[PDB]
Amino acid sequence: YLERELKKLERELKKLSPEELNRYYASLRHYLNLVTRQRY
Numbered sequence: 001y002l003e004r005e006l007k008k009l010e011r012e013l014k015k016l017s018p019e020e021l022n023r024y025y026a027s028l029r030h031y032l033n034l035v036t037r038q039r040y
Helices: 003-013 018-035
Strands: none
């Protein structure tokens, strides 16, 4: 139940490019699509 702190969190995480993480995120999500289907 930390909705307020979430704003204080995204503000600190935003220190790193919020577009650079998403780049590295898609190259990790597309893995889990077939990397977790046999390794939960």
